[PDB]
């Protein structure tokens, strides 16, 4: 019943006589599938969970320095060298300084000056590869006919409630069966292998901050980086070398780039971590649904004979359907809820079609809540629910 209200809702109807029905489940999107002599069920892909992530390349966004040293030489005497140029935790640079009597040299020209500083990273970020093999799609299934508004937002007690069930499909087990009680069972043949190439992206992990970025963007970061599991390349990105009157050289780090990245990431898809497994908020999934084993529930029931009471205001949805919350004080339940529209109260001709196919009440106890969906025809009609002299009637109009 969770498709009621979302804008990205598609109503698919297979060809007459065909057996196969294909659907595409998107994040935030909802597909309401119908079939002749089959129940209307809503299936939505809620969360995508990727496991077994491993390190690829880590960028540093905050570094630290210590132990700076210098060395100078006279003009045309060659370049200056220090032993830590072969030390990979140090970053050096040779420059040209004017040398003479005041500096202590006897020649005409520039003298080479080299200065090194110990490299150390204070706060760093990590990019991790997303393997389509270790990838999990979690699907939730929800059926119409029962499960009033109180079941829309309810996540505790899903192991005990038979109407709601959690589905998980990975490339290791592409098939799963939903125990659906009275409505039978639905098949779910999904294609995670041909749904979306998630191989061209990286999963970045900042200081407890997590995003989904292009792999083109990740290798273009002008910052110190190291691959896999430390050997840092491209040290020059974070360090400034100040020239001091062409005699000595000082080294300073640049401020923290944590904020500069957060601004540039404007547009990137965010994610969060459920401990060690990371969940996503984007991506689609193609599935194939079985209509053979999926059955109705209540076609042999008689019409609900006891009276009905409008408990809440009947409202309309984004697609033209009408839902109503009502109270059935009767005890002859389970009973088939009488629902149809009529444009003429004298002919009482059943026009249109029920969206929630064969809405049924389950409990024989009074003061129970129930909601159903209706599809009126274009133009004038009247929502008439119930039968006999205790049926309740409501006004409605289309377009």
């Amino acid at each position: 019943i969770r498709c009621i209200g979302v804008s990205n809702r598609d109503f698919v109807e297979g060809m007459s006589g065909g057996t196969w029905v294909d659907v595409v489940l998107e994040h935030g999107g909802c597909v309401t599938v119908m079939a002749q002599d089959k129940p209307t069920v809503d299936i939505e892909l809620v969360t995508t969970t990727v496991s077994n992530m491993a390190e690829v390349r880590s960028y540093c966004y905050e570094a630290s320095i210590s132990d700076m040293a210098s060395d100078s030489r006279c003009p045309t005497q060659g370049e200056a060298y220090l032993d830590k140029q072969s030390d990979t935790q140090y970053v050096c640079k040779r420059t040209l300084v004017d040398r003479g009597w005041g500096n202590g040299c006897g020649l005409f020209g520039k003298g080479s000056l080299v200065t090194c500083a110990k490299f150390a990273c204070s706060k760093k970020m990590t990019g991790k590869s997303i393997q389509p093999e270790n990838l999990e799609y979690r699907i939730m299934l929800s059926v119409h006919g029962s499960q009033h508004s109180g079941m829309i937002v309810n996540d505790t007690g899903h192991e005990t409630d038979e109407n709601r069930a959690k589905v998980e499909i990975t490339p290791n087990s592409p098939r799963a069966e939903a125990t659906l009680g009275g409505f039978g069972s639905l098949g779910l043949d999904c294609e995670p292998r041909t749904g979306l190439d998630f191989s061209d992206l990286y999963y970045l992990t900042m200081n407890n901050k997590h995003w989904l970025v292009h792999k083109e963007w990740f290798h273009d970061i002008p910052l110190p980086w190291h691959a896999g599991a430390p050997h840092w390349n491209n040290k020059e990105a974070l360090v400034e070398f100040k020239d001091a009157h062409a005699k000595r050289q000082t080294v300073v780090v640049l401020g923290s780039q944590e904020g500069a990245v957060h601004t540039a990431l404007a547009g990137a898809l965010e994610a969060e971590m459920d401990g060690a497994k990371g969940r996503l908020s984007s991506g689609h999934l193609k599935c194939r649904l079985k209509m053979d084993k999926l059955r109705l529930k209540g076609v042999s029931y008689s019409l609900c004979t006891a009276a009905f009471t409008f408990t809440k205001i009947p409202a309309e949805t984004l697609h033209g359907t009408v839902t109503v919350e009502v109270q059935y004080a009767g005890t002859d339940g389970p009973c088939k809820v009488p629902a149809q529209m009529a444009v003429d109260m004298q002919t009482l001709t059943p026009v249109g079609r029920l969206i929630t196919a064969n809405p049924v009440i389950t409990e024989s106890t009074e003061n129970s809540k129930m909601m159903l969906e209706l599809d009126p025809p274009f133009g004038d009609s009247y929502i008439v629910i119930g039968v006999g002299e205790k049926k309740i009637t409501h006004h409605w109009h289309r377009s």
Partner: antibody
Amino acid sequence: QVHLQESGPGLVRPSETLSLTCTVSDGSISSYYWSWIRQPPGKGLEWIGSIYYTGSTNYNPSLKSRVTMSVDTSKNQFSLRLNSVTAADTAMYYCAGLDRYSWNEGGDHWGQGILVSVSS
Amino acid sequence: QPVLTQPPSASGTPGQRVSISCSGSRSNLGKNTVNWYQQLPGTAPKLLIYNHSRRPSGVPERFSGSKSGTSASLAISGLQSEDEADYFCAAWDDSLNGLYVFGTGTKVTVL
């Protein structure tokens, strides 16, 4: 025209296996919660156990100690095994498709019944 | 399992109306269906009422059932001498795995 009919040894030795099968005709074996019931003369009826066509296994808590039930989806049949039978288990056995949720027109359905005795 | 207590012997002359009680617990009648059976000796009980007073073709209109919160009743209008038998009420229970429990049984006898 659906019809249920028991079939099996009407007399067995004690401590043996009480095996009973029941074939369903003109009907889907996937359309019911196929079950077994018993009734000793004088006492009340005792429901033996249920099994669903997918393999959903359900036993009587009072009889789950020595009940093993099987169902063949191909042959449209379902079977029953009872090891370590006592003389007190002399009852009249019926195969029936019980409707766990009462969703089917006509409701439950019953066979003709077989009275089984054990001689020691 | 709270045992269902029923009176053992019910009697009455021809032409009278006799109702049969069937009281259960929250686990069984509060969520499931109620069925009635007429037991004849030496044979299997035959389905009279299933799913709140519907009867398959062949069961007369004279029979009618009714369910309450935790108790069930069967009304026998137009009693006949051919109706002298034991009657059991059976209903599903939503206990450990889902059980089908029968009633204790009541002897009905015409004078």
